[PDB]
Design an enzyme around this catalytic site. Structure first.
Site, PDB file in Angstrom:
ATOM      1  CB  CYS A 106      -0.873  -0.203   1.096  1.00 51.36           C
ATOM      2  SG  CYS A 106      -1.900   1.650   1.492  1.00 51.36           S
ATOM      3  NE  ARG A 109       2.437   0.663   3.510  1.00 51.64           N
ATOM      4  CZ  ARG A 109       3.613  -0.066   3.515  1.00 51.64           C
ATOM      5  NH1 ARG A 109       3.866  -0.494   4.959  1.00 51.64           N
ATOM      6  NH2 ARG A 109       4.535  -0.199   2.739  1.00 51.64           N
ATOM      7  CD1 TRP A 278      -7.030   9.081  -2.209  1.00 53.89           C
ATOM      8  CD2 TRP A 278      -7.912   9.543  -0.217  1.00 53.89           C
ATOM      9  NE1 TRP A 278      -6.048   9.758  -1.332  1.00 53.89           N
ATOM     10  CE2 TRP A 278      -6.481   9.971  -0.169  1.00 53.89           C
ATOM     11  CE3 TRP A 278      -9.025   9.477   0.820  1.00 53.89           C
ATOM     12  CZ2 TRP A 278      -6.082  10.384   1.156  1.00 53.89           C
ATOM     13  CZ3 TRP A 278      -8.209  10.078   1.918  1.00 53.89           C
ATOM     14  CH2 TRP A 278      -7.023  10.482   2.162  1.00 53.89           C
ATOM     15  CD  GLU A 283      -6.210  -0.053  -8.147  1.00 52.05           C
ATOM     16  OE1 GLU A 283      -5.598   0.357  -7.400  1.00 52.05           O
ATOM     17  OE2 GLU A 283      -6.955  -1.123  -8.234  1.00 52.05           O
TER      18      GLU A 283
HETATM   19  C1  HEM Z   1      -6.420   6.683   1.637  1.00 54.15           C
HETATM   20  C2  HEM Z   1      -5.930   6.509   0.460  1.00 54.15           C
HETATM   21  C3  HEM Z   1      -5.450   5.118   0.154  1.00 54.15           C
HETATM   22  C4  HEM Z   1      -4.715   4.935  -1.300  1.00 54.15           C
HETATM   23  C5  HEM Z   1      -4.275   6.370  -2.095  1.00 54.15           C
HETATM   24  C6  HEM Z   1      -3.983   3.631  -1.260  1.00 54.15           C
HETATM   25  C7  HEM Z   1      -3.189   3.211  -2.462  1.00 54.15           C
HETATM   26  C8  HEM Z   1      -3.054   1.918  -2.716  1.00 54.15           C
HETATM   27  C9  HEM Z   1      -2.644   1.118  -4.047  1.00 54.15           C
HETATM   28  C10 HEM Z   1      -2.532   2.135  -5.172  1.00 54.15           C
HETATM   29  C11 HEM Z   1      -2.592  -0.057  -3.663  1.00 54.15           C
HETATM   30  C12 HEM Z   1      -2.325  -1.203  -4.716  1.00 54.15           C
HETATM   31  C13 HEM Z   1      -3.753  -1.293  -5.419  1.00 54.15           C
HETATM   32  C14 HEM Z   1      -3.702  -2.832  -6.686  1.00 54.15           C
HETATM   33  O1  HEM Z   1      -2.875  -2.149  -7.259  1.00 54.15           O
HETATM   34  O2  HEM Z   1      -4.360  -3.368  -6.466  1.00 54.15           O
HETATM   35  C15 HEM Z   1      -2.967  -0.281  -2.401  1.00 54.15           C
HETATM   36  C16 HEM Z   1      -3.064  -1.617  -1.835  1.00 54.15           C
HETATM   37  C17 HEM Z   1      -3.456  -2.113  -0.563  1.00 54.15           C
HETATM   38  N1  HEM Z   1      -3.810  -1.044   0.415  1.00 54.15           N
HETATM   39 FE1  HEM Z   1      -4.050   1.014   0.125  1.00 54.15          FE
HETATM   40  N2  HEM Z   1      -4.445   2.920  -0.328  1.00 54.15           N
HETATM   41  C18 HEM Z   1      -5.214   3.815   0.454  1.00 54.15           C
HETATM   42  C19 HEM Z   1      -5.737   3.422   1.638  1.00 54.15           C
HETATM   43  C20 HEM Z   1      -5.970   2.240   2.421  1.00 54.15           C
HETATM   44  C21 HEM Z   1      -6.890   1.765   3.413  1.00 54.15           C
HETATM   45  C22 HEM Z   1      -7.978   2.580   4.230  1.00 54.15           C
HETATM   46  C23 HEM Z   1      -6.550   0.368   3.740  1.00 54.15           C
HETATM   47  C24 HEM Z   1      -6.819  -0.615   4.613  1.00 54.15           C
HETATM   48  C25 HEM Z   1      -7.625  -0.019   5.727  1.00 54.15           C
HETATM   49  C26 HEM Z   1      -5.325  -0.012   2.704  1.00 54.15           C
HETATM   50  C27 HEM Z   1      -4.912  -1.331   2.528  1.00 54.15           C
HETATM   51  C28 HEM Z   1      -4.309  -1.653   1.536  1.00 54.15           C
HETATM   52  C29 HEM Z   1      -3.991  -3.296   1.275  1.00 54.15           C
HETATM   53  C30 HEM Z   1      -4.048  -4.493   2.347  1.00 54.15           C
HETATM   54  C31 HEM Z   1      -3.550  -3.200   0.062  1.00 54.15           C
HETATM   55  C32 HEM Z   1      -2.965  -4.658  -0.744  1.00 54.15           C
HETATM   56  C33 HEM Z   1      -4.246  -4.953  -1.458  1.00 54.15           C
HETATM   57  C34 HEM Z   1      -4.162  -6.337  -2.238  1.00 54.15           C
HETATM   58  O3  HEM Z   1      -3.397  -7.358  -1.647  1.00 54.15           O
HETATM   59  O4  HEM Z   1      -4.932  -6.732  -3.325  1.00 54.15           O
HETATM   60  N3  HEM Z   1      -5.228   1.176   2.006  1.00 54.15           N
HETATM   61  N4  HEM Z   1      -3.256   0.834  -1.678  1.00 54.15           N
HETATM   62  C1  LIG Z   2      -5.102 -12.565  -6.417  1.00 50.12           C
HETATM   63  C2  LIG Z   2      -5.009 -11.504  -5.851  1.00 50.12           C
HETATM   64  C3  LIG Z   2      -4.175 -11.423  -4.627  1.00 50.12           C
HETATM   65  C4  LIG Z   2      -4.154 -10.002  -3.945  1.00 50.12           C
HETATM   66  N1  LIG Z   2      -3.405  -9.783  -3.087  1.00 50.12           N
HETATM   67  N2  LIG Z   2      -4.866  -8.772  -4.594  1.00 50.12           N
HETATM   68  C5  LIG Z   2      -5.565  -9.035  -5.834  1.00 50.12           C
HETATM   69  C6  LIG Z   2      -6.546  -7.883  -6.081  1.00 50.12           C
HETATM   70  C7  LIG Z   2      -5.667  -7.178  -7.266  1.00 50.12           C
HETATM   71  C8  LIG Z   2      -4.457  -6.657  -7.095  1.00 50.12           C
HETATM   72  N3  LIG Z   2      -4.201  -5.459  -7.994  1.00 50.12           N
HETATM   73  C9  LIG Z   2      -5.458  -5.524  -8.985  1.00 50.12           C
HETATM   74  C10 LIG Z   2      -6.285  -6.298  -8.405  1.00 50.12           C
HETATM   75  O1  LIG Z   2      -7.134  -5.519  -7.130  1.00 50.12           O
HETATM   76  C11 LIG Z   2      -8.008  -4.480  -7.542  1.00 50.12           C
HETATM   77  C12 LIG Z   2      -8.456  -3.462  -6.339  1.00 50.12           C
HETATM   78  N4  LIG Z   2      -7.247  -2.712  -6.010  1.00 50.12           N
HETATM   79  C13 LIG Z   2      -7.862  -1.830  -4.945  1.00 50.12           C
HETATM   80  C14 LIG Z   2      -8.825  -0.873  -5.384  1.00 50.12           C
HETATM   81  C15 LIG Z   2      -7.458  -0.331  -5.442  1.00 50.12           C
HETATM   82  C16 LIG Z   2      -7.268   0.576  -3.945  1.00 50.12           C
HETATM   83  C17 LIG Z   2      -6.774   1.721  -4.585  1.00 50.12           C
HETATM   84  C18 LIG Z   2      -6.885   2.881  -3.353  1.00 50.12           C
HETATM   85  C19 LIG Z   2      -7.091   2.488  -2.014  1.00 50.12           C
HETATM   86  C20 LIG Z   2      -7.643   1.394  -1.841  1.00 50.12           C
HETATM   87 CL1  LIG Z   2      -8.039   0.860  -0.175  1.00 50.12          CL
HETATM   88  C21 LIG Z   2      -7.768   0.447  -2.820  1.00 50.12           C
HETATM   89  C22 LIG Z   2      -5.561 -10.191  -6.400  1.00 50.12           C
END
Ligand code: HEM
Ligand SMILES: Cc1cc(N)nc(C[C@@H]2CNC[C@@H]2OCCN[C@@H]2C[C@H]2c2cccc(Cl)c2)c1
Ligand code: HEM
Ligand SMILES: Cc1cc(N)nc(C[C@@H]2CNC[C@@H]2OCCN[C@@H]2C[C@H]2c2cccc(Cl)c2)c1
Ligand SMILES: C[C@H](O)[C@H](O)[C@H]1CNc2nc(N)[nH]c(=O)c2N1
Ligand SMILES: C[C@H](O)[C@H](O)[C@H]1CNc2nc(N)[nH]c(=O)c2N1
Ligand SMILES: [Zn+2]
Lengths: 402, 404
Positions: A106, A109, A278, A283
């Site tokens: 993320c 953070r 947000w 993305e």
């Molecule tokens: C506030 C604005 C936030 C921004 C701009 C942001 C940005 C991002 C981005 C760009 C990713 C990668 C998304 C992807 O490629 O799928 C990500 C992943 C992630 N974020 Fe954030 N984030 C935000 C808030 C949060 C919040 C509120 C949480 C949890 C309380 C969080 C927890 C996570 C987690 C667990 C991942 C990994 C998700 C996965 O494995 O699919 N983030 N973040």
């Molecule tokens: C197999 C698998 C494993 C994992 N760890 N994640 C995924 C999800 C996969 C990993 N990148 C594409 C797909 O997620 C799209 C959703 N992205 C979150 C919306 C973006 C986001 C952006 C800003 C803030 C927040 Cl809280 C969340 C798939």
């Protein structure tokens, strides 16, 4: 023991000592690195719980105090008698923020300390899950002025099935597999779309049909709930200078809200704990719209821009990708919906690395996910070495419940 | 599937299992507790076992495994190490080994070309003057007036208690960096140190942004000696843009030949401390890293100003638009000048083919994701969606600490 972490743009060096607090193994060994892979008893619960209560009491500067000692006693008494325990709302709050703080993938953070936590552990039906979900959306969306939030549903229990949200996000668009194997809408959601229909949803036929939610209370079939359209904020895409772009009929939803991850705190597992911040614009602009196994619009845009498509070396892909990203930012700014570009997000992330170096001696970070998908080395995170590892509380991936 | 890493392509859905990583004889820097995959830099017993392994490799590759000539070569290597403490490679062993070191290099996206490498044997070299001659020959052959040819030149190996052959320059061709009055640098900030070294060993410096550095070449147990490359040997490409006519007025340029000169080539425990090799450029290295890195030529803001972009706010994407046009200028200019170049799209497509070839040939391919994905437009290329497993195979190229 402690890895040296160098920034190559600035020449500065830190040492990550935090990684020593990691108690869960990742996928790498000295023989081979697997860092690019997306998905590579009472006494154990008791020490995870103790360690977490230790983290909580220390966070409020009350280590060793009476309250600390007595809370460790309550935990042990509960686990010894019952095989499990329950968190206080204040602890749930701290643990959720910390799981965000600890999340290596993320880039957002810097915001970790500002998280609205809705306690939904008194949920007993799919119906009540739906109400809580609707309130989350409303709160989080806030007419475009987005606020980070998580709603936490009842923990996993040894005796029974999980609460689960079948959707991977609270808002996603349908993908309709067509007569000739092409897809209308989002190819990533053909399957969940097929599940909604089989559970009796009447499908649209658009490229941008918001899916219903399939919600599952323990040991029940999932249940279908349509989100009221006025709750789902969306942004039409247009371009600051290219007028025909608006006519592509493109759009994206305001609220990115992940609903498939498991939240682990103190050894307790929350299988349904949707969360939302947000968007970072790349993305939408790059991944959702330009991935070739997603909306795949690059070629259409390039042709609209009258670029030469016949050869890779005109860099028509790069050119169109840029405009599409610009359109995303402009359109969100115009509809007055919160969004951050990859330059601003990565700069805030570098500041976060520095805050965490001081606060805890390191910050677990997954370089491949932090570095944006366009303009990598144009952002400062490209030049920054990062150490990746698992701290608890944590968010964990969980496979689709079907 | 088995007890070997599963490797997925998220674009196509396809799956493979890497079995080659089983052959890794050397530990990387990762452990189960933490991944260090993103860091740039993380005796008779030992020698013989490394030699035996390499000789086994060579014999597999000619399909003569377990043969009389195989066992005889093994016995000849043990006897050599038994009486001299080292051994020597046959000409064909060297060629095989140098190709295999390239093939094995996890950070190289150009590996589809691995089998086509001209190997110049310079194991007879006995002076810095002679290294200079060999290097000049490498440059002429490799440059081939713009139709570039992969090549490596191999100087004598490290020997017990006798100094190494070393090229002090990190590449055969690099631009000077001159530290200024106000603390700014004219030319390439990357090369400030080597530039000051060349001045100290008697080089008369220029004062341009693009002055080719001389070579500092070290023969065993001597100070390095300075050699200026004849300018007709160093092919350069002035940069212009296909539609933006002012871009040529910037006086930007780059050299044709990327030739790495500070890597150690290790083969069967033998160490070649001087073995410079060259290919052709992938354009994003010049356009994005060399010219836009903040700590390199850093020209993004100047180009965005000429483009009249709003440089006062990040959300105009001025950095992204400028970088695209600089990358385009690099490709156009090389094509115009008829110098071999490959764009990041064609390079990454060809590396995906390489992955498929190596899956069939060897059951996997060591690859460093952070290095293989290019620095602009990452997810627009197929490699972004491809999981990769990274591990150290030998023969290998190893980074070498600067000899100063
Ligand atoms: C506030 C604005 C936030 C921004 C701009 C942001 C940005 C991002 C981005 C760009 C990713 C990668 C998304 C992807 O490629 O799928 C990500 C992943 C992630 N974020 Fe954030 N984030 C935000 C808030 C949060 C919040 C509120 C949480 C949890 C309380 C969080 C927890 C996570 C987690 C667990 C991942 C990994 C998700 C996965 O494995 O699919 N983030 N973040
Ligand atoms: C197999 C698998 C494993 C994992 N760890 N994640 C995924 C999800 C996969 C990993 N990148 C594409 C797909 O997620 C799209 C959703 N992205 C979150 C919306 C973006 C986001 C952006 C800003 C803030 C927040 Cl809280 C969340 C798939
Ligand atoms: C044939 C054309 C080639 C292309 C297009 C190519 C492409 C590239 C690129 C883009 C890099 C990353 C460079 C960087 O960011 O610093 C690289 C690295 C590398 N390549 Fe190649 N390559 C080619 C030929 C070669 C040859 C001939 C060899 C040796 C025989 C080689 C071995 C290496 C090694 C050892 C690295 C890593 C260097 C380091 O760690 O600094 N490549 N390649
Ligand atoms: C500390 C350090 C460690 C390592 N392993 N490499 C370096 C060199 C660092 C790592 N990326 C930048 C810098 O190299 C720039 C030159 N790259 C070679 C020109 C490109 C190239 C391109 C095509 C073919 C070939 Cl044979 C070679 C520095
Ligand atoms: C194979 C590779 O690890 C995978 O494509 C990753 C790369 N980086 C990513 N980065 C982010 N932020 N999100 C992603 O989905 C991915 N995908
Ligand atoms: C810290 C990070 O590992 C570093 O900046 C790397 C990232 N990827 C790279 N990839 C290539 N090809 N060349 C490089 O110099 C780098 N630098
Ligand atoms: Zn690793």
């Amino acid at each position: 023991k402690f890895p040296r972490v160098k920034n190559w743009e600035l020449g500065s060096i830190t040492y990550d000592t935090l990684c020593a607090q990691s108690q869960q193994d990742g996928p790498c060994t000295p023989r081979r690195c697997l860092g690019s892979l997306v998905l590579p008893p009472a006494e154990q619960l008791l020490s995870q719980a103790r360690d977490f209560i230790n983290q909580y009491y220390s966070s409020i500067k009350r280590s060793g105090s009476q309250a600390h000692e007595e809370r460790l006693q309550e935990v042990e008494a509960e686990v010894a008698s019952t095989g499990t325990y329950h968190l206080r709302e204040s602890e749930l709050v701290f643990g959720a923020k910390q799981a965000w703080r600890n999340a290596p993938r993320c880039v957002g953070r810097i915001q970790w300390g500002k998280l609205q936590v809705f306690d939904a552990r008194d949920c007993s039906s799919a119906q009540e899950m739906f109400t809580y979900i609707c309130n989350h959306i409303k709160y989080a969306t806030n007419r475009g002025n987005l606020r980070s939030a998580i709603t936490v549903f009842p923990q996993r229990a040894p005796g029974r099935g999980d609460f689960r949200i079948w959707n991977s996000q609270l808002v996603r668009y349908a993908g309709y597999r067509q007569q000739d194997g092409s897809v209308r809408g989002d190819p990533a959601n053909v399957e969940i779309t097929e599940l909604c229909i089989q559970h009796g949803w009447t499908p649209g036929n658009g490229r941008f049909d918001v899916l219903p939610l399939l919600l599952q209370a323990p040991d029940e079939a999932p249940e279908l709930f349509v989100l009221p359209p006025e709750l789902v904020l969306e942004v039409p895409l247009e371009h600051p200078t290219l007028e025909w772009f608006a006519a592509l009929g493109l759009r994206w939803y305001a609220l990115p809200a992940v609903s498939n991850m498991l939240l682990e705190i103190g050894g307790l597992e929350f299988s349904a704990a949707p969360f939302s911040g947000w968007y970072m614009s790349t993305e939408i602009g790059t991944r959702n719209l330009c991935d070739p196994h997603r909306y795949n619009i690059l070629e259409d845009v390039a042709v609209c821009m009258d670029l030469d498509t016949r050869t890779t070396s005109s860099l028509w892909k790069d050119k169109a990708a840029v405009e599409i990203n610009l359109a995303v930012l402009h359109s969100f700014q115009l509809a007055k919906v919160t969004i951050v570009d990859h330059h601003a997000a990565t700069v805030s992330f570098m500041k976060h690395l520095d805050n965490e170096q001081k606060a805890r001696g390191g910050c677990p970070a997954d370089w491949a996910w932090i570095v944006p998908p366009i303009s990598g080395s144009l952002t400062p995170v490209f030049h920054q070495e990062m150490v990746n590892y698992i701290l608890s509380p944590a968010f964990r991936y969980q496979p689709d419940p079907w």
